[PDB]
């Protein structure tokens, strides 16, 4: 119909509020025409939307008002992807998921909200294969061109000054990245990266908020970490069954530690084990408390690594 007119409008090089007025009515057309109409705008039309965005994202200097333009593109993208074609079409662009990630600027909350909301929906898709890993891959790509932490944007959207809805959308993406992932190591690896960046002190603040959408997300993040602990508890039982021979287990530890920075430490541990003083009654209790301490460090609940910066440990009963 009039779809080609929009493409010709976008490729013509409009600016400021002209570019805005057009994109606004394009969002309307996208949201109100049949699915038929979106397909004719198609890969061609999306490509230009993304080109315009790629131009805008290249910002060098208080701030640009063209965040209205950026956010309005994100809005078209939602409308475009509001039907099965749009999604599969966006997943095919080389820079679509990346440009969304770049639009997660905590300094413009409402855009990040809408962007992180799309990225979350992509994450929990069945096809193609490992969607979450692609979304994560893109976050890493953005993190290297900026020289920051790939999760800094997300954590920043969670800190106390930020709006309550940004906080939800943020933790929503967190769960979108963790939950669909199948391998235990990968879930714990990512969660431990979040804690490393400072997620723990934040979640404390977040639980006290009585917002329904928020409470739901914290429930999911809790549930997804409680699962991992169970699977780890399970993994431990598999070990306790297969590894019942002193020589065999000890060989496996050497085989995994050999030629890694972890090697000197293991010898150091064993050298200490010689020190447990020679006394009939005190010795087995040293080995129990040692076992207690190693049990706590290894089988850390919440499905996270222990904080390796934390310099004090309680080792209970």
């Amino acid at each position: 119909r009039s779809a080609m007119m929009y493409i010709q409008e976008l490729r013509s090089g409009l600016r400021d509020m002209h570019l805005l007025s057009c994109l606004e009515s394009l969002r309307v057309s996208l949201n109100n025409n049949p699915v038929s109409w979106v397909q004719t705008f198609g890969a061609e039309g999306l490509a230009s939307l993304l080109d315009i965005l790629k131009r805008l994202h290249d910002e060098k200097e208080s701030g640009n008002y063209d965040s209205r333009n950026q956010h309005e593109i994100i809005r078209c993208l939602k409308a475009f992807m509001n039907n099965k074609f749009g999604i599969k079409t966006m997943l095919e662009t080389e820079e679509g998921i990346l440009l969304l990630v770049r639009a997660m600027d905590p300094a413009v909350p409402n855009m990040m909200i809408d962007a992180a909301k799309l990225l979350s929906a992509l994450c929990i898709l069945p096809q193609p294969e490992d969607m979450n890993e692609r979304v994560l891959e893109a976050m890493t790509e953005r993190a290297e061109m900026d020289e920051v932490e790939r999760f800094q944007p997300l954590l920043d959207g969670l800190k106390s000054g930020t709006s309550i809805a940004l906080k939800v959308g943020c933790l929503q993406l967190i769960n979108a990245l963790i939950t669909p992932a199948e391998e235990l190591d990968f879930r714990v690896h990512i969660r431990s990266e979040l804690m490393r960046l400072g997620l723990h002190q934040v979640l404390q603040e977040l639980r006290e908020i009585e917002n329904e959408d928020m409470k739901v997300q914290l429930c999911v993040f809790d549930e997804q970490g409680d699962e991992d602990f169970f699977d780890l508890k399970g993994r431990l039982d598999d070990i306790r069954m297969e590894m019942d021979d002193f020589g065999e287990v000890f060989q496996i530890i050497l085989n995994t530690v050999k030629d890694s920075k972890a090697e000197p430490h293991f010898l150091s541990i064993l050298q200490h084990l010689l020190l447990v003083r020679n006394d009939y009654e005190a010795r087995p209790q040293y080995y129990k408390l040692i076992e207690e301490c190693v049990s706590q460090i290894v089988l850390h609940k919440n499905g996270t690594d222990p904080d390796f910066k934390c310099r004090h440990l309680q080792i209970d009963i």
Partner: protein, 433 residues
């Protein structure tokens, strides 16, 4: 004089003489123009003060009287023997006649026997008793020993005596070991039960041919049990029997412990105990004849007839206890032959208790082979259950995320995204388990 374009290697003069490599050297003219050993007129390219160090490690440092009777064979040997003995000749004689228990040992006597010149030469030396001082050291010994009546017999009896209690401790333990094993193997009803169990199982396999409904089998065959195995070749009859015991009749597992002495009897030579008692009886009958044919003790110091009769009484007493046990032992073996039905004449006692000892060890080995193998089963069955259970839970979680969106092929409508975003908000996208 003068080699092919070079100079002779420096002549050394060491202090300490050293161990050396006896190699095939190369002299001056074994070398050609372009060879390796011509280039090494160096000899200085590796010089130190290591000679000290080398020497340290390889240093290799630290008329009267004529012979009247004896040949220089024996007259020389005695010169050495008497050099080590240092005992007055007139004392040795006295210690021989008295049989002085405190001075005499098995080692001492055994040397005298060996070193003594034969009775022919002792006689020819006791005809020269007067001229004692003119004689040599070796012959002086002989002149003393010549006045001892019947020396060769006297010394033999002394040896057998000092050697008697020692050789009883060679027969006895072994007589007991075979007695014990014969009685343990007769007492063991756990062993018994194995046979009964084996017979049944065998009687059934023997189906409808040659052997079948057999009342028994030969105890020998016990080791051959391991030789029957499954068609898949995964496990043996022994193993099955062992496993049948392990589960249904745990009592049977105690039979290796009921056959305590069975190992010790596998090692005892049956033919060497026979020879030993035949020798002991002989040696007794020897001293017996010696005592009867002995001259009257014509000096106060000759205690031979006295002490040897006190030894024949005792040596015969201990021997008859020994023989009793042996003939007892042999009975209990023939008893086993009649009981478990096997020819005791064709299998020597060691041979029989070896087959038995071996079987014990096969059974105990089959028992740990049953445990180890069964341990492999339970772990591998638990590991596959836990993996089925993990995979089941995993698929359930997959489908719960797929009930969101049909990425299949159905008609295009505009819910999709607004339908995904709602499930994100409510938590429906993050289903649990």
């Amino acid at each position: 004089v003068l080699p092919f374009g070079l100079t002779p290697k420096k002549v050394y003069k060491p202090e300490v003489q050293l161990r050396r490599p006896n190699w095939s050297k190369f002299v001056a003219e074994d070398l050609s123009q372009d060879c390796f050993w011509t280039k090494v007129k160096e000899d200085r390219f590796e010089n130190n003060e290591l000679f000290a160090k080398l020497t340290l490690a390889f240093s290799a440092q630290t008329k009267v009287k004529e012979l009247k009777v004896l040949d220089s064979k024996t007259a020389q040997n005695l010169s050495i023997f008497l050099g080590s003995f240092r005992m007055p000749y007139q004392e040795i004689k006295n210690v021989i006649l008295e049989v002085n228990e405190a001075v005499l040992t098995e080692s001492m006597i055994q040397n005298l026997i060996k070193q003594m010149p034969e009775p022919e030469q002792l006689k020819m030396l006791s005809e020269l008793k007067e001229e004692y001082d003119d004689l040599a050291e070796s012959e002086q010994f002989g002149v003393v020993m010549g006045t001892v009546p019947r020396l060769r017999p006297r010394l033999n009896a002394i040896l057998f005596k000092l050697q008697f209690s020692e050789q009883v401790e060679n027969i006895k333990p072994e007589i007991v070991s075979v007695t014990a094993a014969c009685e343990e193997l007769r007492k063991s009803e756990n062993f018994s039960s194995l046979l009964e169990l084996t017979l049944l199982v065998g009687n059934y396999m023997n189906a409808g041919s040659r052997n079948a409904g057999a009342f028994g089998f030969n105890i020998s065959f016990l080791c051959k049990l391991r030789d029957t195995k499954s068609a898949d070749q995964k496990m043996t009859l022994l193993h099955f029997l062992a496993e049948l015991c392990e589960n249904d009749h745990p009592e049977v597992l105690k039979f290796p412990d009921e056959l305590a002495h069975v190992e010790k009897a596998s090692r005892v030579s049956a033919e060497n105990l026979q020879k030993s008692l035949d020798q002991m009886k002989k040696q007794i009958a020897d001293v017996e004849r010696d005592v009867q044919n002995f001259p009257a003790a014509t000096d106060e110091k000759d205690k031979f007839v006295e002490k040897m009769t006190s030894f024949v009484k005792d040596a015969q007493e201990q021997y008859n206890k020994l023989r009793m046990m042996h003939s007892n032992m042999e009975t209990l073996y023939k008893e086993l032959g009649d009981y478990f039905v096997f020819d005791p004449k064709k299998l020597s006692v060691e041979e029989f208790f070896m087959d038995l000892h071996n079987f014990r060890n096969m059974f105990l080995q089959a028992v740990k082979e049953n445990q180890k193998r069964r341990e492999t089963e339970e772990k591998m069955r638990r590991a596959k259950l836990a993996k089925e259970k993990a995979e089941k839970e995993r698929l359930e979680k997959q489908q719960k995320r797929e009930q969101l969106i049909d990425m299949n092929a159905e008609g295009d409508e505009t819910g999709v995204m607004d339908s995904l975003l709602e499930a994100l908000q409510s938590g429906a996208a993050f289903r649990r388990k």
